[PDB]
Each structure stands twice: as structure tokens, then as C-alpha cells.
Amino acid sequence: TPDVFISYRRNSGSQLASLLKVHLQLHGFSVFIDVEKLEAGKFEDKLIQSVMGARNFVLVLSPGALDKCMQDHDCKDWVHKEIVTALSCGKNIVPIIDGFEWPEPQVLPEDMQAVLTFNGIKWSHEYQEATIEKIIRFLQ
Amino acid sequence: TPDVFISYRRNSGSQLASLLKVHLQLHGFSVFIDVEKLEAGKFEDKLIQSVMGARNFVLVLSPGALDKCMQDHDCKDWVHKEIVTALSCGKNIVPIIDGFEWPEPQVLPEDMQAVLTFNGIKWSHEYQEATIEKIIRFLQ
Amino acid sequence: TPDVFISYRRNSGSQLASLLKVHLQLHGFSVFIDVEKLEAGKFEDKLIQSVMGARNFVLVLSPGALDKCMQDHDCKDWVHKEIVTALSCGKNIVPIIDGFEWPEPQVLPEDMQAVLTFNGIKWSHEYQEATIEKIIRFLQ
Amino acid sequence: TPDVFISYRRNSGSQLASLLKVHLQLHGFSVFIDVEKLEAGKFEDKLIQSVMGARNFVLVLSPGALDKCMQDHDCKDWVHKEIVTALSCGKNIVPIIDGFEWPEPQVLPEDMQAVLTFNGIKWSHEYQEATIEKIIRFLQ
Amino acid sequence: TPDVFISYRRNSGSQLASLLKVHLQLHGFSVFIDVEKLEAGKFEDKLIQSVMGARNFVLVLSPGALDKCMQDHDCKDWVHKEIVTALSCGKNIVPIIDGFEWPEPQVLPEDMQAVLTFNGIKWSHEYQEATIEKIIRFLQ
Amino acid sequence: TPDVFISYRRNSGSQLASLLKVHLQLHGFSVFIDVEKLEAGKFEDKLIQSVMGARNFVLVLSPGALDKCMQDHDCKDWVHKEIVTALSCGKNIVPIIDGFEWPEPQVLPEDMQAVLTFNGIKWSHEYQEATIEKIIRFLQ
Amino acid sequence: TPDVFISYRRNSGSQLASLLKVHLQLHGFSVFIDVEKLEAGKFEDKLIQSVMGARNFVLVLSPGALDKCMQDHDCKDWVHKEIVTALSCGKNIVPIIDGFEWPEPQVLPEDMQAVLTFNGIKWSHEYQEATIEKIIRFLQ
Amino acid sequence: TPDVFISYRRNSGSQLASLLKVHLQLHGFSVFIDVEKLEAGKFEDKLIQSVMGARNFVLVLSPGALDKCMQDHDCKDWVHKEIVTALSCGKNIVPIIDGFEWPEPQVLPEDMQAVLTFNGIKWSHEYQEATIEKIIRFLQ
Ligand SMILES: Nc1ncnc2c1ncn2[C@@H]1O[C@H](COP(=O)(O)OP(=O)(O)OC[C@H]2O[C@@H]([n+]3ccc4c(I)cccc4c3)[C@H](O)[C@@H]2O)[C@@H](O)[C@H]1O
Numbered sequence A, B, C, D, E, F, G, H: 001t002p003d004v005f006i007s008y009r010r011n012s013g014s015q016l017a018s019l020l021k022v023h024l025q026l027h028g029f030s031v032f033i034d035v036e037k038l039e040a041g042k043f044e045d046k047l048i049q050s051v052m053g054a055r056n057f058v059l060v061l062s063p064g065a066l067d068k069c070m071q072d073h074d075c076k077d078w079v080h081k082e083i084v085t086a087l088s089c090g091k092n093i094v095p096i097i098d099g100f101e102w103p104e105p106q107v108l109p110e111d112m113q114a115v116l117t118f119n120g121i122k123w124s125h126e127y128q129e130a131t132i133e134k135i136i137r138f139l140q
């Protein structure tokens, strides 16, 4: 299974996730993204099983990324699902912040709380080689 | 039996399906379609045993192709019947999306909810060369 | 150089226009379509230039095909603009008819009304191969 | 000297501008971007002196990328200042469409209004591989 | 193990905190600052485990540095709970004074009230060479 | 003579002026700061001669560093008096940004307008080493 | 422990207290002033114990010295707190008067009234040696 | 003859000046103060002829040390008479600042405004050892 798994929001952070894919690949990482690796069949059994098999779990944080996860107690939203699988399996979550404004824990569901307690990486357009060299530092 | 069976709405996807049917045949994929092989008076007992024979099932989801299917408990709608044999027989469904908007699962009857859970291909009018490849990779 | 220049409306004739092209170029003709052969630069020069360079002209009709062409007295529309260019030079126009309501000439621009007298070919949902012989016989 | 020169907005097209530069380099192109090639001194000379120095001119269009270019007849904006240099010197202009909604040519100033007449390349998230080869196809 | 551990507010004590780290390091110390040594994973378990291992404990005070610690009886504020673990563990608390005002001791939480009863060092910009030597003297 | 002359506002840039002095000294540069190289006598003669001496000119732009320069027609403020000297002799100006609100040129006196037209470096607390690496690239 | 303890009011007696130390020091006496001998750790225990260990006790009575001791029932004020420890251990109190006019002690707490009954010493600028020499004759 | 001449206001500078005198003497500078040297007879030609002989001219600037000199057009004030002799002879002036609020030049007579343009020394109660060391560098 690819080492890094990238979880993003389609209508908010598609360009960041694709830039993250390219730099990591040039540095010897095997990355998974849905618009490249997802194929024929039912798409539920491939997202959940692919998250587990990847050592790292990059989460792209872009403005209003977790708005749909709000009040999603039933666990229908597909960003709600992905974080839950990463926590329970205990992966190395590396949130990348790009214009994200953090809320307070009581606004989100109870299952996906531990993501807020992870050390993220600031994405900076002024010093990118420094931001990229830092992300590679976190990844295993 | 034909490699690919095409299911489309008569008053919507007729043009996409015909455009879709030709492209596959140029690539060695024998294709079945009603307007070319449907006769003999008793047509039910061939068209139902035409979707069983072909392993690949294509559901051309043109805008509002499921409109006349809600509350069809009798399952009289023809479009409803073809997919059922695909789900009952566990076929390889490859939906092609052209402007469709996905209703919530609770909307449509519970019987046919399976088709909503299959990864689908978005037909691109500007990059038609790459869209043809992605369909090939999905089809068996 | 191009031999057949195809005109259509992207909001209704996209699939129809795409289907026509594949057969004509299959038989050995040369075809120009915007979403393929159009190149870098300014296009208003190229389209009108390409329309002239094509001995054959094809028009695709469809409901809403000329809704935007109505009251285009300034010749800003691209369907109206390209039709007259071919019309003036006596280009071989081969219209294709579709399911739409025929509007009376007065509403449409007077200069463009001259194309209505050409011997169009109706598109058949059940005799697709029949139309290919009829249309390709019009060409050289 | 540089071969390509990328213009964009820093609050809407920086992720697409960064992804665009990465791919161009792998294919042997020398892309100029501000956050990398800009150094010490007065930047109004190196930017302009490099706009006219590169054969190709690339512009990234994003949601509302030209509003700061509207009614700015004073020419104080820099995306404006870069295009006129490319429009005037007759470089190869390659717009990229990423959610852009085209305005009618009247709103923008006169010296910039000829950019709307070029042939942009739609950015597709589903078919990024086909998008890049097109851009390279345009670059010369 | 880090010899020193700097606890500062981010929005006002970062310039003082970073200058301290440089001067302390040149004398052979091993300072811990979050932006340099905090890495991948949940961060709370790391610094609390790093302060406990920190022989000393520089607390940069800044105009309103402890503004956010009043009424934080929950022990959630981060400057707040950082001090408590060193009072609880009985470390060498060395307040650094740069523009700070001393309020009534009642308002602060009772778990951290012992912090106001320590000998502080006043930072001076006219005599920086002299305030650095005094800091190095307070460190054991 | 030295290599760098550092200008700041003592009320807000004192920490960033001392942080940038020690880093630049460790790289083999000679830095003039007012509270170290300034001895006894008429300081006006020494400041103006020190600005003229060092080839480089670093200006620490912090929140409001140019507020006192507004309406300074008489040229009495001392940060203003140093910038006019640097521009006139054509030195190498390297502004450093920190929380700065960039103003419209008109507010500042006409004498020192050219400072805003030089390329600067944004000070980053998370990526400080890359920032210091960038400054050394500007310096001569 | 010191041979003499200096208690003063920092907003008045600092300059005098600094002149007392530099004169008692030259006569062999060992002195405790807070600005130079107070160091790492908690300070309250060190200054209420230094009064105890001190062999002599000096109270610099300067304008406004005992204003803050007024109605200090809790004995928080350090000028108040340092006297009581001096009286309890039977120490020698040698007040120095510099423009101080003693009040009625009814208002003062009954635990401080003992100070005024001690033989005071007046500081004379004109005849410093006479007052310096008398102070030593009192230091026993 | 004395090498350092101390000017002070007896209602404020008496204590600091006496402190400043003792520290200077221990380092080997023959200092001149009125209470220690102003002999009998007529005192005008005593300290007016001394400052000229003394190379350095220290001036204690306690709160209101030049508030009586304001509008002293008659040269009556004795602090005024000493600055003019120091300036008019071109001596080395070393102001010592203690709780001073620097006035705007126009408030003072033109004869002695030149004393404000000398690099003064800020007296620090916490860092007197550095303060005293700094004066030694400023002396000659
Ligand atoms: N005895 C008779 N002989 C000849 N024509 C008859 C007839 N009775 C009725 N019609 C006509 O057929 C229409 C029903 O079609 P529609 O009402 O539009 O429904 P859909 O568009 O949803 O279906 C779209 C999908 O159905 C599958 N399909 C295939 C063959 C079908 C046949 I043969 C008959 C009916 C439905 C069929 C549906 C096909 O594969 C396609 O892909 C009626 O209106 C009549 O004009």
C-alpha cells in the first residue's frame, strides 16, 4: 500500500493536495490520492482499506474543511469517515494548515476529536523548500 | 456474449449512449445495445438474458434518468429492471455521469440503492481522449 | 488541411457533434473540431479562417440551438458569426435536424435566414448507420 | 534566460501557480516565479525585464482573479502591468482556467482587453495528466 | 534532555524568546523551544515530559503575558498549565521582565499563585550585555 | 567600515534588531547598532557617517515603524534621517517585514518614497533559518 | 549573613541607600542590598531571614517612606515586614532621616511604633563626613 | 586640577551626584564638586574657572535639573552658567540621565541648546556596574 495517504476536501483544497503529491513523489514516497488511485468497484471498501495500509496520514486543512463533519453523528461525511479510521488504527496524522481557523472541540463529533491534538505543519508560500523539508522530517 | 452492455434512458442518454457505444467497439470491446439487436416479438427474455451474459454493466446517468422510478414498488419501469439483474447477479457496474445530481439514498427506493455506491466516471467534453482511457481501465 | 468544419452548440449538441466527427474521419476525411485542433493564440482569427479553409460545412440543430442566436444583430454570437461566414462564400452546408421547434424566420436575423433552404439530413435514433451513408455521400 | 513567466494572484492562484511551475521544470523548462527568482533591489525592473525576456507568458485565472484589474486604469496593479508587457511585446500567452467566470470585454481596461481573446486551457482535477501535456503543447 | 526550557506567549514574547535561545546556546546550554524541537505526533505529551526533564525554566513575561491565565481554572490555557507543572515539580522558575506589570495575586489561579513570589530579571536594551550575564547566573 | 547598518524603532523593533544583529555577526559581517557602536560626542555626525559607510542597509519594519515618519516634513525623526541618507548614496536597502501594514505611498513624505519600492524579506518565526539564509543572499 | 542590612523605599531612598552601601563597604562592613545580592530562588524567605542574620539594621527614612505602611494590617508591605523581623530579634535600628517629618503613631500599627523611639540620624549634604562618622559610631 | 566637573541641582542631584563622585574617584579621576571644594571668599570665579581646566563635563539630569534654566536670558541660574562655559570652550560633555523627560529644544535658551545633542548615559539601579563601566568609556 502507498506510504502517505492524503485526505482533503474536494471543493476547497484540491490544488494543495496535488502539489503535496508531486513533491513527496520526487523524494521517494508512494502517495495515494483519489483522483489517481481509485478505480472500478464500490468506492467505500477502497478508501477505508487504503487508509489503514498507509504508514502516514496527511490531512490537508483548508478554510472550512470540517464544516460538513459538523452534526454528522451518523458518520456519513467522507472526511468524517477517513479521520475515524486513522485514529482507531493509530496512524501518524500530519495535518497541514493552509488558512484553517481552528474551532473548539465541542463543535465537532465525539469520534473525530483527537485530530485537533496533533502537531501540524504551517504551509508557507514564501519559504516552500523549508516547508517541504519540514514535512519530510515528520513522515516515517 | 458481448463484453459491454449499455443501459440508458430513452429520452435523455440516447445520444450519449450511441456516442459511447461506438467508441468501445473501435477498441475491440463488443457492445450490445437495444436499437441494434432487439426483435423477435418476445423481447423481455432476450434483453434480461443480455445483461446477465455481459459481465460489464453501464448505467448512463443522464440528467434525471431516475425521475420515473420513485415508488415503483411493482418495478414496472424498464430502467429499474436492468440494474436489478446487475445487482442480483453482482455485475461490474461502471456508471458514466453527465450532469447528474445525486439524490440522497433515502429518496430512491431501498431496492435499487446499490447503484449509488459504485464509483463513476465523469464524461469530459474537452479532454475526451483521456476520458476514453479511464473507461477502458474500468471495463473488464 | 481541414476538409470538414463542424458547427454545434456546446449546451445541447456536444454529444451529437462528437458522434458525427468519429464516423466522418473514420472513412478517411479530414475534420476540424474546436476541442481538438484549436491551438495557442487568438482564436477569432482561426475559427473564421478555418471555416473558409473547409470546403464542407456542417450545422447541428437542437432545442435551444438558436435561442441565443435570436436578436444577435451585432453578430457577437459565435454560432451566428460562423454560419454567415461559410454562407457568404457558398460553402457546402449540410444541416442536421434534431427534435426542436422550428422558429419563424422573422425573429431570426435576416442575413442568417438563407441557410434554411439547404437539404438537411434528419438524425434517426434507430438507423444511425443509414444516416452515415446519406451524409458521407453529400461530401466528396 | 527564462523561458516561461508565471503571473497569478497570491490569494487565489498560488497553489495552482506553484503546481504549474513544478511540472514545467521536469520537462526542461526554465520557469520564472516571483517568490523564487526575485531578489535584492527594485523589483519593478526585474519583473518587467523578465516579462519581456521569456518567450512564453503564462497567466493563472482563478475565481475573480481580475477584479483588482477592473477599473484600475492607473496601471498600479502588477498582474495588469505584466500582461500589457506580454501583450505589447507579442509573447506567447497561455491562460489557465480554474473556476474562472469570464467577464464581458468592456469592464477591463483597453490595454488589457486583448487577453480575453486568447485560448485558455481548462484545469481539470480529474484529468490533470491530460491538462499538463496540453500546456506543454502550447508552450513553444 | 534540555538544560533550559523557554515558556513564552506567541503574540508578544517570540522576539525576546528567540534572542534568548541564541545567547543561551552560545554559552553551551541546550534550550528547548517549541518551534525548533516539537515534532510529529500529539504535542501535549512531549513538552510536559520535556519541562519535567528541564533543569531550569525561563518564563518570558511580556505586556499582558499572563492575561489569558485568569479564570482558567480548567488548566486548559497553555501558559497556565506550563507553569503549574514546574511549580508542581519544583523547578527553578526564572521570570524575565520586559514591559510586564504586576497585578494583585488574588486574580490568578491558586495553583499558579506561587509564581508571583519569585526573583525576576529585568531585561534592558541599553545594557543587554549585563542582563545576559545575570540570566546565566540564575541558571543552575 | 562595517558591512551592515541597522535602522529600527526603539519602541517596537528592539528585539528584532538585536536578534538580527547576532545572526548576521555569526556569518562574518560587521553590523552597526546604535546601543553598541555609538560612543560619546555629537551622535548626529556619527550616525550619518555610519550610514554612508556600510554598503548594506537593513531596516527593521515592525508594526508602525513608519508612523512617526508621517508628516515629518522637517525631517526630525531619526529613522527617516537614516533612510534618506541610504537612498541618496545608492546603498543596498534590505527591509525586513514583521507584522507590518504596508501603506499607500502618499502618506509618507516625498523624500523617502523609494524605500517602499525595494524587495524585502518576511520574517518567519517557524522558518527562521530559511529567513536568515535569504537575508545573507541579499547582503554583499 | 551580613554585618548591616539596608531597608529603604525604591521610589525615594535608592540613591541614598546606594551612597550608604559604598561608604559602609569602605569601612570593612559587609552589607546587604537587594539590587545586587538577591539571586536565584524565592526572595521572601531570603530577605526576611537576612534581617534576622544581619548584625545591624538601617532604615532610610526619606519622603514618603512610611506612607505605604499605613493600615498594612496584613503586613504585606516589605518596609513594614522588614521592621518587625528587626524588632523581634532585638536588632539595632539606626534610622537615617533625609527630609522626613515624623507623624503621630496612633494610626500606625502598634507593632511598628517602636521605631520612632530610636535615636535618629540626620543626613547633611554639607557635612557628609560628620554624619558618615556618626553612623559608624552607631553601628555596634 | 580636577579632570571631571559635576553640575547638579542640589534639590535632586545631591544624592546621585555624591554617589557618582565616589565611584569616579576610585577609578582615578580627580573630580570637582561644590560641597567638597567650593572654598570661602567669593565663589563665582571658583567653579567657573575650574570647569575650563577640567577636560570632561559630567552633568546630572535629575527630574527638573534644567527647569529653572528655562528663560534664563540673564544667565542667572548657576547650572546655566556651567553649560555655557563647557560648550563655549568645546569641552567633552557626558550627560547622566535619571528619571529625565527630554524637552524640545525651543523651550531652552539658544546658548545651551547644544547640550541636548550629546550621547547621554542612562543610570540603571539594577545594572550600575555596567552603567559605571559605560561612563569610563565615555570619559577622556
Ligand atoms: N410492444 C412494443 N414494441 C415496440 N415498442 C414498444 C412496445 N411497447 C412500448 N414500446 C415503446 O417503448 C417505449 C418505452 O420506453 P421509455 O418509456 O422511453 O422508457 P425508458 O426511456 O426508461 O427506457 C430506456 C431503456 O429501456 C430499454 N427498453 C428496451 C426495449 C423496450 C421495448 I421492445 C418496449 C418498451 C420498453 C423498452 C425499453 C432500453 O434498453 C433503453 O435503454 C414506449 O414509450 C413505447 O414508445
Ligand SMILES: Nc1ncnc2c1ncn2[C@@H]1O[C@H](COP(=O)(O)OP(=O)(O)OC[C@H]2O[C@@H]([n+]3ccc4c(I)cccc4c3)[C@H](O)[C@@H]2O)[C@@H](O)[C@H]1O
Pocket (backbone or CB within 6 Å): A006, A007, A008, A009, A010, A011, A034, A038, A043, A047, A068, A078, A079, B097, B102, B116, B117, B118, B119, B120, B121
Ligand atoms: N459514485 C460516484 N462517482 C462519482 N462521483 C460521485 C459519486 N458519488 C458522489 N459523487 C460526487 O462526487 C462528490 C464528492 O465530493 P463530496 O461528496 O463533497 O466529498 P468530500 O469532498 O467532502 O470528500 C473528499 C475526499 O473524500 C474521499 N472520496 C473519494 C471518492 C468519493 C466518491 I467516488 C464518491 C463520494 C465521495 C467520495 C469521497 C477522497 O479522499 C476525497 O479527498 C459528491 O459530492 C458528488 O457530487
Ligand SMILES: Nc1ncnc2c1ncn2[C@@H]1O[C@H](COP(=O)(O)OP(=O)(O)OC[C@H]2O[C@@H]([n+]3ccc4c(I)cccc4c3)[C@H](O)[C@@H]2O)[C@@H](O)[C@H]1O
Pocket (backbone or CB within 6 Å): D006, D007, D008, D009, D010, D011, D034, D043, D047, D068, D078, D079, D082, F102, F116, F117, F118, F119, F120, F121
Ligand atoms: N516592497 C515589498 N517587499 C516585500 N513584500 C511586499 C512589498 N510590498 C508589498 N508586499 C507584500 O506582498 C504582497 C503582494 O501581494 P499583492 O500586492 O496583492 O499582489 P498580487 O498578488 O495581487 O499580484 C500577484 C503578482 O504580482 C507580482 N508581484 C511580485 C512582487 C511584489 C512585491 I516584492 C510587492 C508588491 C507587489 C508584488 C507583485 C507577481 O508576479 C505576482 O504574480 C502585498 O500585498 C504585501 O503584503
Ligand SMILES: Nc1ncnc2c1ncn2[C@@H]1O[C@H](COP(=O)(O)OP(=O)(O)OC[C@H]2O[C@@H]([n+]3ccc4c(I)cccc4c3)[C@H](O)[C@@H]2O)[C@@H](O)[C@H]1O
Pocket (backbone or CB within 6 Å): C006, C007, C008, C009, C010, C011, C034, C043, C047, C078, C079, C082, D102, D116, D117, D118, D119, D120, D121
Ligand atoms: N477566451 C476563451 N478561452 C477559453 N475558453 C473560453 C474563452 N471564452 C469563453 N470561454 C469558454 O468557452 C465556452 C464556450 O463558449 P459559449 O459561450 O458556450 O458558446 P457556444 O459553446 O454555445 O458556441 C459553440 C460554437 O461556437 C464555437 N466556439 C469556439 C470557441 C469558443 C471559445 I475558445 C470561447 C468562446 C466561445 C467559443 C465558441 C464552437 O466551435 C461552436 O461551433 C464559453 O461559454 C466559456 O465557458
Ligand SMILES: Nc1ncnc2c1ncn2[C@@H]1O[C@H](COP(=O)(O)OP(=O)(O)OC[C@H]2O[C@@H]([n+]3ccc4c(I)cccc4c3)[C@H](O)[C@@H]2O)[C@@H](O)[C@H]1O
Pocket (backbone or CB within 6 Å): A102, A115, A116, A117, A118, A119, A120, A121, E006, E007, E008, E009, E010, E011, E034, E038, E043, E047, E068, E078, E079
Ligand atoms: N493542533 C495544532 N497543531 C498545530 N498548530 C495549532 C494546533 N492548534 C492550534 N494551533 C495554532 O498554534 C497556535 C498556538 O499558539 P496559542 O494558541 O496562541 O498559545 P499561546 O500563544 O497562548 O501559548 C504559547 C505557549 O504555548 C505553548 N504551545 C505549544 C504548542 C502548541 C500547539 I503544536 C498547538 C496549540 C497550542 C500550543 C501551545 C508554547 O510552548 C508557547 O510557549 C494556536 O493559536 C493556533 O494558531
Ligand SMILES: Nc1ncnc2c1ncn2[C@@H]1O[C@H](COP(=O)(O)OP(=O)(O)OC[C@H]2O[C@@H]([n+]3ccc4c(I)cccc4c3)[C@H](O)[C@@H]2O)[C@@H](O)[C@H]1O
Pocket (backbone or CB within 6 Å): E102, E115, E116, E117, E118, E119, E120, E121, G006, G007, G008, G009, G010, G011, G034, G038, G043, G047, G078, G079, G082
Ligand atoms: N516577584 C517579583 N520579582 C521581581 N521583581 C518584582 C517582583 N514583584 C515586584 N517586583 C518589582 O520590584 C518592585 C518592588 O517595589 P515595591 O514593592 O513597591 O517595594 P518598595 O517600594 O517598598 O521598596 C523596596 C522595599 O521592599 C523590599 N523588596 C525587595 C525585593 C523585592 C522583590 I525581588 C520583589 C518584590 C518586592 C520586593 C521588595 C526592599 O528591601 C525595600 O525595603 C515592584 O514595583 C516591581 O517593579
Ligand SMILES: Nc1ncnc2c1ncn2[C@@H]1O[C@H](COP(=O)(O)OP(=O)(O)OC[C@H]2O[C@@H]([n+]3ccc4c(I)cccc4c3)[C@H](O)[C@@H]2O)[C@@H](O)[C@H]1O
Pocket (backbone or CB within 6 Å): H006, H007, H008, H009, H010, H011, H033, H034, H038, H043, H047, H078, H079
Ligand atoms: N553667599 C552664600 N553663601 C553660602 N551659601 C549660599 C549663599 N547664597 C546662597 N546660598 C545657598 O545656596 C542655595 C542656592 O542653591 P540652589 O538654589 O539649589 O541652586 P543650585 O541647585 O542650582 O546650585 C547647585 C549647583 O550650582 C552650583 N552652585 C555652587 C555654589 C552656589 C552658592 I556658594 C550659592 C548659590 C548657588 C550655588 C550653586 C553647584 O556646583 C551645583 O552644581 C541657597 O538657597 C542658599 O541656601
Ligand SMILES: Nc1ncnc2c1ncn2[C@@H]1O[C@H](COP(=O)(O)OP(=O)(O)OC[C@H]2O[C@@H]([n+]3ccc4c(I)cccc4c3)[C@H](O)[C@@H]2O)[C@@H](O)[C@H]1O
Pocket (backbone or CB within 6 Å): F006, F007, F008, F009, F010, F011, F034, F043, F077, F078, F079, H102, H116, H117, H118, H119, H120, H121
Ligand atoms: N541625547 C540622548 N541621549 C540618550 N537618550 C536620549 C537622547 N535624546 C533622546 N533620548 C531618549 O532616547 C529615546 C530614543 O527613542 P525614540 O525617540 O523613539 O527614537 P527612535 O525610535 O527613532 O530611534 C530608533 C532609531 O533611531 C536611531 N537613534 C539613535 C540615537 C538616538 C539618540 I543618542 C537620542 C534620541 C534618538 C536616537 C535615535 C537609531 O539608529 C535607532 O535605530 C528618546 O525617545 C528619548 O527618550
